[PDB]
Amino acid sequence: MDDANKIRREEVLVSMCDQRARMLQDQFSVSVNHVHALAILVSTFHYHKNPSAIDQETFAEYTARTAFERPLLSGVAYAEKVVNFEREMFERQHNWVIKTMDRGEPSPVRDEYAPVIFSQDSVSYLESLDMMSGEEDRENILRARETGKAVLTSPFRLLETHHLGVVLTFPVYKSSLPENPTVEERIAATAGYLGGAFDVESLVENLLGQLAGNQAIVVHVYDITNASDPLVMYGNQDEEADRSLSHESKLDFGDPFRKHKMICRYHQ
Amino acid sequence: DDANKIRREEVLVSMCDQRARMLQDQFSVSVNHVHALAILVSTFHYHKNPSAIDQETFAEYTARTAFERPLLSGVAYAEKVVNFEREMFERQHNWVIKTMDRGEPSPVRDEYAPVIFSQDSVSYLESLDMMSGEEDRENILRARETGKAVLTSPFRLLETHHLGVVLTFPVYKSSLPENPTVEERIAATAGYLGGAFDVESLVENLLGQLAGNQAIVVHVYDITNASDPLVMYGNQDESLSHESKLDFGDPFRKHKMICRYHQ
Ligand SMILES: C[C@@H](CO)CCNc1ncnc2nc[nH]c12
Ligand SMILES: C[C@@H](CO)CCNc1ncnc2nc[nH]c12
């Protein structure tokens, strides 16, 4: 009840929330950095090396053995850019058809596609799926290749698991990319897309659930890219929580196109 | 005195702790990225047959990922070569295994750790037997016997003579058993992936540009032997200090940061 004890109660909330935000941000940053390395791996060992050192078996092995490097990711995969003019050739070479993500059916005719050719076994169900056949993934692919940098989706329910998460995508370019490229040049030089699923629902719960004092606190994370349309990224927004006091902790997941925040309250 | 003294202490603690965290974190990021490179050499050079990694490819990949390893001046891969294999090895590589101190052809040794892949920043390592330097040799043995990353004491690095510490990870053959004994680890050793933490230059770059640097004296000590602390960073000087914690990830070594005001 005490007013002095209430001041310390807020102090503890601030400290607990800020620490959890720092942990989330750092672990995401670590994962993004190692995804960047994998993009460079595909460029160096698949494209530049004659012949390629990377087949599906090799990609699976290397990503499984390095899974610890990418803590908030459920899996990574590499999608190759395929223009329609090339599709029949691509399918014949690979001995499979490009499929849609919603039903795993043969893709209808599209101007281009992003079929997954390499996958971590944890996301093996992505193999042959056109990652341009989901809207979140399509928008990410385009912004990745146009900006040259890592990009994040809005929160959505991921394939197979239906877990609420976000996808991270990095562009991979051909050696023909000019120095100081225009966006038009980036697009022309695009080889493909190295992506990873941040399974927020499962893996952030796992992270937070092991911390001392977790039962005392309610943690929510929001995508606030659009001020007037905040989107839940993590948490049950409306569970029994202490309505009188909250704290907002800063989060920066590294994509200037997106904005995020964490909000913590006590249970009772 | 006196309220101002309290504030002065609180500033020192904050300054020192922040510098310590920054250094530990950058070290940790580098170690993790070096572990990934050890895994890459294993996957591409040993698990694939024929090998699908070479000097050109290693140099390209390490150059492009240099940003991932902030306190490291360079990385290289040294392969385990036992004496009976030396003739075949030298014929395959078209060069002789050389000593670190003079670059002379190595006298006969039971085994050697010649650098076969190198980042171009440490190109001078190529063909050098990393067992011909005592700090590197001890590191190599402990890396292979423990199965984990290891650090040297502070010592002066090749070429630059900068004071630094070497990080080594073991790379094993697929014949390594599960829950191996140390004898099994040695027998299954393929090589050693290492790099030099150039403390003198790169930690100075990290800490020296920070606001308030002119007001404090910062040291980092290797305190593995409490009775013989060894300077890793700072001057050779021997009231109000503060000790900030550091953990660079090798249980065999211990370190600490000490900060003091000038006056
Ligand atoms: C391979 C890359 C290409 O940028 C996207 C990964 N995208 C995804 N990865 C895993 N699960 C998903 N569920 C929906 N999208 C997903
Ligand atoms: C390739 C690895 C094998 O453990 C050692 C790196 N060791 C070193 N790397 C760079 N400079 C050095 N100066 C002295 N030793 C050095």
Side-chain angles (χ1 to χ4, degrees), chain A residues 2-236 239 241-267, chain B residues 2-237 239 241-263:
Chain A
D2 206 339
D3 291 324
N5 280 317
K6 271 184 194 176
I7 285 151
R8 290 187 281 269
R9 185 165 181 269
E10 201 191 336
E11 281 178 339
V12 173
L13 186 66
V14 169
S15 180
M16 290 177 74
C17 201
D18 282 348
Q19 181 162 54
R20 285 154 175 79
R22 290 193 309 273
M23 282 175 172
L24 197 47
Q25 179 171 317
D26 294 352
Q27 296 289 280
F28 186 94
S29 182
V30 170
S31 296
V32 167
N33 275 321
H34 293 130
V35 174
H36 193 168
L38 292 173
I40 291 168
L41 186 91
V42 168
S43 170
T44 294
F45 283 91
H46 180 59
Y47 295 115
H48 295 173
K49 194 177 195 292
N50 186 357
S52 173
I54 299 184
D55 56 12
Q56 168 48 33
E57 177 179 28
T58 304
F59 189 93
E61 172 178 333
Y62 183 73
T63 60
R65 289 178 77 179
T66 61
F68 73 92
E69 302 275 14
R70 299 182 300 280
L72 286 174
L73 297 175
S74 63
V76 294
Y78 179 68
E80 191 165 79
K81 175 176 173 185
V82 181
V83 192
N84 193 60
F85 192 51
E86 309 177 299
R87 176 175 170 183
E88 286 186 14
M89 169 189 296
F90 176 94
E91 295 180 342
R92 188 165 199 81
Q93 182 184 321
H94 287 274
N95 203 34
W96 48 256
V97 299
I98 299 175
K99 299 176 186 57
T100 62
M101 75 167 60
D102 70 324
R103 317 229 273 192
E105 291 175 355
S107 175
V109 177
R110 299 284 176 261
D111 284 2
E112 64 179 306
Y113 317 81
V116 172
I117 65 167
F118 308 133
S119 60
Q120 193 184 335
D121 283 345
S122 61
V123 293
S124 57
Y125 47 84
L126 300 172
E127 195 86 6
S128 86
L129 304 188
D130 179 7
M131 298 319 290
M132 286 173 137
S133 64
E135 274 303 292
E136 305 89 353
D137 278 284
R138 193 186 62 82
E139 297 176 353
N140 233 40
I141 279 163
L142 299 185
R143 199 168 69 263
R145 74 189 190 182
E146 299 185 14
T147 63
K149 298 191 184 182
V151 294
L152 293 173
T153 69
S154 301
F156 69 109
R157 294 195 175 281
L158 299 177
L159 290 173
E160 293 288 298
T161 66
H162 310 301
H163 291 167
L164 189 67
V166 299
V167 164
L168 166 72
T169 306
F170 268 94
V172 178
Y173 298 105
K174 293 176 189 193
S175 69
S176 59
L177 185 70
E179 63 178 344
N180 302 338
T182 65
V183 173
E184 282 271 275
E185 290 170 334
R186 282 185 189 283
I187 296 165
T190 293
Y193 324 101
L194 195 302
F198 284 94
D199 182 344
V200 176
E201 191 175 333
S202 185
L203 299 182
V204 173
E205 179 182 40
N206 182 77
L207 187 155
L208 294 175
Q210 292 175 81
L211 304 179
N214 71 91
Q215 316 91 322
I217 186 167
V218 170
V219 181
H220 303 150
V221 181
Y222 296 91
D223 179 333
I224 58 169
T225 302
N226 184 333
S228 59
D229 184 27
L231 297 175
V232 168
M233 187 182 164
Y234 179 78
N236 190 341
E239 67 185 306
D242 196 74
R243 180 51 54 183
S244 63
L245 174 62
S246 66
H247 184 66
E248 175 167 348
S249 290
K250 287 176 58 54
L251 283 175
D252 182 353
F253 291 137
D255 180 353
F257 195 82
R258 302 285 178 208
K259 310 294 169 197
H260 300 87
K261 71 179 181 179
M262 178 177 284
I263 305 296
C264 303
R265 304 169 173 278
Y266 287 107
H267 267 93
Chain B
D2 290 290
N4 278 291
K5 297 263 209 310
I6 286 168
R7 292 166 218 144
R8 184 164 169 89
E9 177 73 352
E10 291 169 341
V11 174
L12 182 63
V13 170
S14 183
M15 287 182 75
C16 201
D17 283 353
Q18 184 170 44
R19 286 161 169 75
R21 294 195 304 280
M22 287 176 173
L23 181 57
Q24 189 172 295
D25 288 354
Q26 289 290 270
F27 207 108
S28 175
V29 173
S30 300
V31 170
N32 279 313
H33 279 97
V34 176
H35 191 169
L37 290 176
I39 293 162
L40 194 153
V41 171
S42 166
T43 300
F44 286 84
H45 198 43
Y46 299 108
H47 289 197
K48 285 176 81 74
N49 188 71
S51 162
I53 191 161
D54 61 13
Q55 166 56 27
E56 175 175 20
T57 307
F58 187 94
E60 179 183 335
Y61 185 75
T62 54
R64 293 176 73 180
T65 58
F67 73 93
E68 302 272 19
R69 301 182 299 277
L71 294 168
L72 293 180
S73 62
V75 295
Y77 178 69
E79 191 166 61
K80 176 175 174 183
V81 180
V82 301
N83 197 56
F84 88 84
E85 294 175 328
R86 175 170 174 185
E87 170 175 304
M88 283 178 286
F89 178 89
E90 296 181 342
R91 178 158 279 107
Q92 179 164 352
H93 293 272
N94 201 33
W95 45 250
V96 178
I97 299 174
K98 297 169 195 65
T99 66
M100 281 174 47
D101 77 320
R102 297 262 278 190
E104 283 162 347
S106 178
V108 173
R109 299 284 176 258
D110 284 3
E111 69 175 304
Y112 320 80
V115 171
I116 59 163
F117 307 141
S118 58
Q119 194 181 338
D120 285 348
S121 64
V122 293
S123 65
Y124 50 81
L125 298 178
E126 183 174 284
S127 85
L128 301 184
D129 176 13
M130 301 311 298
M131 284 175 147
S132 61
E134 274 303 293
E135 302 89 347
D136 279 285
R137 189 186 67 81
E138 293 176 359
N139 231 36
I140 277 163
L141 297 185
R142 192 164 80 262
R144 79 190 185 179
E145 297 182 15
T146 62
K148 299 199 168 64
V150 289
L151 296 170
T152 68
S153 307
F155 75 102
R156 287 199 180 274
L157 305 168
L158 286 172
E159 187 76 7
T160 68
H161 321 284
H162 289 171
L163 188 66
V165 305
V166 167
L167 169 70
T168 306
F169 274 90
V171 175
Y172 298 104
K173 298 182 206 164
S174 55
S175 51
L176 184 72
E178 60 173 333
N179 298 145
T181 61
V182 170
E183 286 262 278
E184 284 170 344
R185 288 177 177 283
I186 297 164
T189 297
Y192 323 99
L193 192 305
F197 276 109
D198 183 343
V199 176
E200 191 169 353
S201 180
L202 303 175
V203 170
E204 181 62 33
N205 179 65
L206 177 59
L207 299 183
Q209 61 187 69
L210 302 179
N213 67 98
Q214 280 147 311
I216 60 155
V217 170
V218 181
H219 289 88
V220 176
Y221 293 100
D222 172 332
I223 55 169
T224 306
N225 189 341
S227 68
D228 190 17
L230 303 173
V231 182
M232 184 175 175
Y233 177 74
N235 71 26
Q236 224 66 30
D237 291 353
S239 58
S241 84
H242 180 70
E243 170 175 359
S244 295
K245 165 76 163 288
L246 296 170
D247 184 349
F248 293 144
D250 182 357
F252 191 83
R253 307 277 180 215
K254 308 289 161 189
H255 302 87
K256 74 182 182 192
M257 176 173 283
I258 305 298
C259 309
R260 197 171 316 251
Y261 284 116
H262 271 119
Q263 303 87 18

